[PDB]
Amino acid sequence: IVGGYTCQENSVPYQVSLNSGYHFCGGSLINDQWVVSAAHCYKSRIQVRLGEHNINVLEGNEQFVNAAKIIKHPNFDHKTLNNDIMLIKLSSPVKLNARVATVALPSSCAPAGTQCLISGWGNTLSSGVNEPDLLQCLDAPLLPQADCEASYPGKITDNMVCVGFLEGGKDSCQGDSGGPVVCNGELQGIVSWGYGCALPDNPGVYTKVCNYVDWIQDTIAAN
Amino acid sequence: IVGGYTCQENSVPYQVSLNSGYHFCGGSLINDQWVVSAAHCYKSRIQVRLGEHNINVLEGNEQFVNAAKIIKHPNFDHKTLNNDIMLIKLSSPVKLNARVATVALPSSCAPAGTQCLISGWGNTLSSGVNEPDLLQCLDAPLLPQADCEASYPGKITDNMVCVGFLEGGKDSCQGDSGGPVVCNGELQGIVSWGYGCALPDNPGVYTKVCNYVDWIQDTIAAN
Ligand SMILES: [Cu+2]
Ligand SMILES: [Cu+2]
């Protein structure tokens, strides 16, 4: 998160860290045994870390759990990052409590103008890399689809939505990938891509989760 | 390397990749059993990879060797990155040949105006991160110390030298760290830090190797 603020400790209780010896992506807990993330965060083995605030200090609320099935969407295409969404089933259900909780899936697609919360332990600079310890937060609105399209000519599918500020300064970045954008209580987007991080006229683009509620549900049911 | 060109295969034969399950820093081979890198690239276990061009494909000239002693300078200070230099002794001597060779240590400090070659598998973007497969190269001059000082007020010690372009566009970046700047045949600088990557008025700053020839030699002798 570039240009964001440090989240109050465990105020984003659905946020998870995907770790393979180091933090490389984020995700969201949608029920006690399943995480949703980006298909681009695929790796053969993943340890999911829940209840985190400081990614480098054990503060006493962490639950570390291995991923048992890691399921990318059938039609994920790495060249366009179209259908960038992946489901992770945990080896064991987690114990839900104040600091580790679920986020609801969307009842419908959110309109342009909605303020959303984006969080992650991703890069905090628009140039160079600085990885933060503490979870970062950003309040940002869903952009009009025609501004998304204007910023990325020919690259936006109906499964993508821009969230951010056309002025730049504030955006998600690498390492936030796979993490949540939640707009009053429901998961509406997954961190996916954008040109640079926090550049003017280059808002971040997100996987539009309302287009996948049926896929997510069938996949959970069948697994 | 931002704004650089892909080096001809094995044209930089002293360049090594420090790997701990992934590439995280560079270094230079200065004799058949020793590598010099940045103290900031310290890790408890390191595999040194020599003879590389494509960091992700085995092309047939690679030699992978573990580090036996990893020695940071006694006075390295992580807050200012002053004395950012580290020596690595390999478990076995490597076999030197056309594609794996040594770079000479400096006979003296190079003057402002010298063109140098910088190489690495570091980040190639001034905003966001993109890690390259193929080794990257950049021709860049040593800057006047007063321009270094003007760009980083109060942060430049006599053990640092700026190399780069005040206009921005071309610079080293994260992942190049610990790698070589060679100015007609001798190692004159080690990739260390800078604000951003390739920003105007923010040239890269390098560990000034001519200040450490005696330390490097005593340390090798004693180990
Ligand atoms: Cu990719
Ligand atoms: Cu550091």
From Swiss-Prot, chains A, B:
CDD domains: Tryp_SPc. GO terms for biological process: collagen catabolic process; digestion; proteolysis; response to nutrient. GO terms for molecular function: calcium ion binding; serine-type endopeptidase activity. SUPFAM superfamilies: Trypsin-like serine proteases (SSF50494). The record marks D171 as: Required for specificity. It catalyses: Preferential cleavage: Arg-|-Xaa, Lys-|-Xaa. The active site is at H40 (charge relay system), D84 (charge relay system), S177 (charge relay system). Coiled coil: none annotated. It is found in: Secreted, Extracellular space. The keyword Plastid does not apply. Disulfide bonds join C7-C137, C25-C41, C109-C210, C116-C183, C148-C162, C173-C197. Keywords: Calcium, Digestion, Disulfide bond, Hydrolase, Metal-binding, Protease, Secreted, Serine protease, Signal, Zymogen. It comes from the Eukaryota. Belongs to the peptidase S1 family. This is Anionic trypsin-2. It comes from Rattus norvegicus. The gene is Prss2.
